[PDB]
Amino acid sequence: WLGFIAGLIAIVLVTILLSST
Amino acid sequence: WLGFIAGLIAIVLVTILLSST
Amino acid sequence: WLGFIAGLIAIVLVTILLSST
Sign of CA dihedral B17, B20, C1, C2: negative
C-alpha–C-alpha distance, residues C6 and C21, integer Å: 23
Question: Quick one: closest CA in C to B5, which residue?
Answer: C2
Q: How far apart are alpha carbons C10 and A1 in whole angstroms?
A: 16
Calculate the CA B16 to chain-centre distance: 8
Contact B7, A10 (CB under 8 A): no
Tell me if chain B has a CB within 8 Å of the CB of A2. Answer: no
How were these coordinates obtained? NMR
Q: What is the least distance, in Å, from the CA of C19 to any CA of chain A? A: 12
Neighbour count for residue C16 (Cβ, 10 Å): 15
DSSP A8: H
